[PDB]
Write a protein that binds this ligand. Structure first.
Ligand SMILES: COc1ccc(S(=O)(=O)N(CC(C)C)C[C@@H](O)[C@H](Cc2ccccc2)NC(=O)O[C@H]2CO[C@H]3OC[C@H](OC)[C@H]32)cc1
Ligand SMILES: [Cl-]
Ligand SMILES: [Cl-]
Ligand SMILES: [Cl-]
Ligand SMILES: [Cl-]
Ligand SMILES: [Y+2]
Ligand SMILES: [Y+2]
Lengths: 99, 99
């Protein structure tokens, strides 16, 4: 799709079998969800944005269905106020900015 | 321009006469800079990042030169770790996402 930015750029995503909405976020290096449970081992990580830092779990090689593509990427899980799709996932679907 | 997202999408801007770089950030509703000085009245505001909230000053009707366009918009000023260009500014230059 092509979208303008008059509204928040939410997309519907299936991540580890779980349906979620997430913000296409060109200012986010990684992808982040709250309230999903993913199997297997993970590693601890922290991330920073405005406001401060969020504590997360990092899962590698997780399935993400997004914009008709199936991608396998890293997902961070922690109590973000909104779910975000970062550049790590958007590069895999060839997303571009036009301005 | 059209850009991919393999690197962080920085752009050079002039905001209230000061040159800065800022991240084109589709996940940000508003535009925020650190360490700029703007004249005149302002209103207090907070913004919630992933971390909670950053305290800012809100300036209305501020010049921003971005991507060969000159726009007038609202700018928030406060100690963000990275300057961002949000959707309030990007809609004024007709930016779009393709994915
Ligand atoms: C109402 O208006 C705004 C309200 C909030 C923001 S924001 O900066 O908090 N933000 C809101 C998002 C989270 C819904 C914009 C994001 O694009 C933000 C923009 C950003 C970029 C860098 C530093 C701080 C913030 N990036 C981060 O949350 O990125 C996180 C996740 O990926 C990592 O890469 C960059 C960060 O690593 C530091 C990590 C901006 C305008
Ligand atoms: Cl890992
Ligand atoms: Cl990694
Ligand atoms: Cl980069
Ligand atoms: Cl300071
Ligand atoms: Y990793
Ligand atoms: Y400073």
């Amino acid at each position: 799709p092509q979208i303008t930015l008059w509204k928040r750029p939410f997309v519907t995503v299936k991540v580890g079998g779980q349906l979620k909405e997430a913000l296409l976020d060109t200012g986010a290096d990684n992808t982040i969800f709250e309230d999903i449970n993913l199997p297997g081992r993970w590693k601890p990580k922290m991330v920073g944005g405005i406001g401060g830092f969020l504590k997360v779990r990092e899962y590698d090689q997780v399935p993400i269905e997004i914009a008709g593509h199936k991608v396998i990427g890293t997902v961070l899980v922690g109590p973000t106020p909104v779910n975000v799709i970062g550049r790590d996932t958007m590069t895999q679907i060839g997303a571009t900015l036009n301005f």
